[PDB]
Structure 1
Amino acid sequence: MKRTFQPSVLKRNRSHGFRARMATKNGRQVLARRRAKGRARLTVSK
């Protein structure tokens, strides 16, 4: 049957990508936390 993950990069980037993340005070805090955590992929982009 049709399951929950129906991949699509356009939507991926638009919803979770760097710039999207960057477009909101909290989206930025998202990055900030991940940087402080020393994460190797801030936001799974190209």
Structure 2
Amino acid sequence: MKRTYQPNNRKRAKTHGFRARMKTKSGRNILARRRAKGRHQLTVSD
């Protein structure tokens, strides 16, 4: 039956996918909360 997620990630593009933290300015720092903030790569392009 239905799991808890399943494929198809539209709400991880124009919302929470790479370039979608400008729509929410105080999300830009959130996007920048693991790149220009601390070590490590990112989590949207592996």
- The number of residues matched between the two structures is 44
Unaligned runs of 5+ in 1: none
Q: TM-score, normalised by structure 2?
A: 0.59
| RMSD of equivalent CA atoms | 2.0
Q: TM-score, normalised by structure 1?
A: 0.59
Q: Greater relative contact order: 1 or 2 (C-alpha under 8 angstroms, separation 6 or more)?
A: 1
Moved over 2 A (4+): 9-12
Identify, as 1 or 2, the structure richer in helix: 1
Unaligned runs of 5+ in 2: none
